[PDB]
Each structure stands twice: as structure tokens, then as C-alpha cells.
Amino acid sequence: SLLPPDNEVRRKHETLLLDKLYDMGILSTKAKLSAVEHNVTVSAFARRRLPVVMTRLRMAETVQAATKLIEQGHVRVGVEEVRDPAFLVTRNMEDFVTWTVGSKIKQNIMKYRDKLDDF
């Protein structure tokens, strides 16, 4: 913000900063350096952590339940399991955080929907 407004490197790095933060899901928009000035927040990073983002994705009921689950090692993201409850899911991995392969949780969901394929 402190650079003069007409400066090419200011504009390029503003668009770069906003694009990087929006792809990492901290911000909500990509058009306001003011939103970077008083919206980037340790609370925003904390809600981009794994148990709260799976709470929003409704994997678990509460954030405590999600932390207990992924400490038991039920939750992969992509193809690798995750045992650290501090993994920061970005906006491209939110579409891939799922359960692990032979999970008792996956079996219980399948048994609720009565589609339990035992093969």
C-alpha cells in the first residue's frame, strides 16, 4: 500500500498476493488489499486447518470429534493418510479430503445408507 498507486511492481505483486491467498483459502475475495489489511487472521488460518474444514464439509459433527477421528487416523487427503491435526487444507484439497480405505466410519456410513458392499 505504501508504494505509489501507479507502480507496475505494486500492481503485479498485489494481484499475486491476492491470488495466492485466495487459492490458499484464507481470504474470501481476490480484489481488496483492504481485505488483506484487516481480514487475514490467525482465526482464518485456524479455520483453514484440517478438523475445522472437515467440520464445514460435514465429515464430523464437531471440531473435537474431527480431531479425535483424524488422530485415530481415519482421514486421508488425496491418497495419503494424515495423522497430524494441523494439516492446512487449501482450496484445491478441500475437494479431496475423504475417509481412508477400510475405515469403520466408512462402513458405518454405508450401513446407514444400506449400501454396504462387503466386496
Binding site: 500500500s1 498507486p5 501507479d6 500492481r11 474470501s28 475475495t29 480484489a31 481488496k32 488489499l33 483492504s34
Partner: protein, 297 residues
């Protein structure tokens, strides 16, 4: 993947509402920037809004870049505007007749990066699924009355808008003899538009001209021999497909090769073809007191 498309649609709509709020603000910030470089006195609420002063000192530069046109608006097309070649498929309705099949082939010839697919027994969610699976840019339906087309539904992908339009005064390619017509020249066509001034007209011009491949800009003003025209009068957009040769510096000869339509748009939905429950953007307001006096586009 379908999770990703749903996520992007929700995030785009949320960013749209955020842009609505921020534009309601930035109408007031621009008076501050103009009053600064001029010295005309301004409103006291603008002058004493302290949060506006802090946020203004932060975000001068984006308003100035928008003034210089360096940046683009949050849109469904500005992501992939002229980098890729937007390929497009055309299908018919469930049971096509022979003249509708020939007409679909005619417009598949009109768009130089188009492919045609038979419907047969192809459920419409599976159609949208397959299009999002093979990264198609746009999809087109056609509805016949009896061998004569009556409706197009230009649907953009992955989650863009649809334009549902009714057709009239159509003449098909496949009625004139082959001795007079021939194989149509597949070249990257120019496009000319006439009569669009409103934001709705600009929206239609964008979602129409983003079906054609982008032209090489080094000698576009002189080369190229095929042009496609969209003119509107009383919001019934009429379109022809001409192919021309420039016999002089001050005269050109035309030759009409494609079909003629006067399509009238009766819906534009912010949401794709499968989403009948998508939020509409404009529909043909009939049965009102002045829906026939008002002229959109």
C-alpha cells in the same frame, strides 16, 4: 471432480455477492479520489468516514487499474478468454428428424471447432456429466417443430450461463441444390455485432462471441474471408453467415452461405443446462402491462 465443480460454483456466487457489497462501497470511494486530484468539495460523510479513509489508502490502485482497463471483471469467461480454443458440440432433441439432423450439421459446420453428437438414448444429466468430463466449452440443444428448428439453448460450461432462444424465419442449408451450394469453408471467422448497448446486450454479446476460436491479431484486419453477423432490432437478434472476397480497396462482394435465423432470447439463466432451478438473469417478460413496450438488449 463434481465436488470441485460444485465448490467453484458456490465460491463464484459468493464472490458475486461480495462484489455487489464492495461496489456499493466503491461508488463512494471514487468520489474521494476524484475530489482529491480536483479540489471540488465533497460530501461530509465521505470526508469523515474513517474506515473508508484507511481502506482507500490501501486500495487506491485497483480503481485506477479499472479506469485504465488493465484488469478484467470477475466473469465466467475472463478466466479462459482467448488462451484456449473453445470447442463446442451440437445435439438435437430426443428423437431427431432428418431435417433437424441436417440443420444441426449446418451449424456444426458454422462453428469451426464444433462436433456433433447423436442423442439416441442419452439422459440429460449424463450429457452434462460427459461435457464437464471432456472439458467442453459449450453445449447446444435444438428443438424441432416438424423438420424445422424452433429453439436453441446455448449453455456454457462448467457452470456458466444458458441462453434459451426461439427461432423463426429459418432457412436451412440443405434446401438449395449442391450445384449452387457446396462444402462450406471452415476458417476462423470474424464476428460483427450491431445494436447492443445495455449491460444485458453486452452479456449476450460476450456469451455469444465466446463460442468461436480467438483470431490471430497480427493481420486480422486484412486476412480472413468469412464473417458472421448478429444484429438486433426490438430484442430479436438476427444472425447470418456470410463469406466474402475483397475485389478492390473500396468494394467487397458478398455471398450468403449459412443459415439465416432471427432468434429471440426468452431466457438467460445463471446456471447450466441441467439446472432448471438455477437463478434466472433475464426472461421474456410477457403477459405484463408493458412487457411489449420495453426493449431489452
Amino acid at each position: 471432480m463434481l465436488r470441485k465443480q460444485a465448490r467453484q460454483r458456490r465460491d463464484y456466487l459468493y464472490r458475486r455477492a461480495l462484489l455487489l457489497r464492495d461496489a456499493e462501497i466503491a461508488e463512494k470511494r471514487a468520489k474521494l479520489r476524484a475530489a482529491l486530484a480536483s479540489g471540488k468539495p465533497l460530501d461530509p460523510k465521505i470526508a469523515n468516514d474513517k474506515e473508508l479513509r484507511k481502506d482507500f489508502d490501501y486500495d487506491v490502485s485497483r480503481d485506477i487499474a479499472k479506469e485504465q482497463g488493465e484488469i478484467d471483471i470477475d466473469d465466467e469467461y475472463s478466466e479462459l478468454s482467448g488462451i484456449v480454443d473453445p470447442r463446442v458440440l451440437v445435439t438435437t432433441s430426443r428423437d431427431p428428424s432428418s431435417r433437424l439432423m441436417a440443420f444441426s450439421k449446418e451449424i456444426r459446420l458454422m462453428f469451426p471447432t464444433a462436433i456433433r453428437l447423436n442423442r439416441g438414448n442419452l439422459i440429460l444429466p449424463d450429457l452434462v456429466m460427459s461435457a464437464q468430463r471432456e472439458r467442453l466449452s459449450d453445449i447446444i440443444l435444438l428443438h424441432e417443430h416438424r423438420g424445422t428448428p424452433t429453439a436453441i439453448t446455448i449453455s456454457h460450461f462448467p457452470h456458466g450461463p444458458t441462453l434459451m432462444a426461439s427461432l423463426h424465419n429459418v432457412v436451412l442449408r440443405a434446401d438449395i441444390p449442391k450445384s449452387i451450394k457446396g462444402t462450406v469453408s471452415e476458417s476462423y471467422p470474424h464476428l460483427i455485432f450491431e445494436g447492443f448497448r445495455t449491460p444485458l446486450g453486452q452479456r449476450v454479446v460476450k456469451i455469444l462471441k465466446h463460442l468461436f476460436p480467438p483470431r490471430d491479431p497480427t493481420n486480422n484486419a486484412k486476412s480472413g474471408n468469412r464473417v458472421i453477423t448478429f444484429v438486433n432490432q426490438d430484442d430479436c437478434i438476427e444472425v447470418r453467415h456470410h463469406v466474402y472476397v475483397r475485389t478492390n480497396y473500396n468494394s467487397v462482394e458478398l455471398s450468403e452461405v449459412g443459415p439465416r435465423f432471427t432468434m429471440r432470447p426468452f431466457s438467460i439463466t445463471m446456471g447450466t443446462l441441467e439446472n432448471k432451478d438455477a437463478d434466472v438473469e433475464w426472461h421474456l417478460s410477457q403477459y405484463t402491462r408493458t412487457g411489449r413496450k420495453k426493449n431489452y438488449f
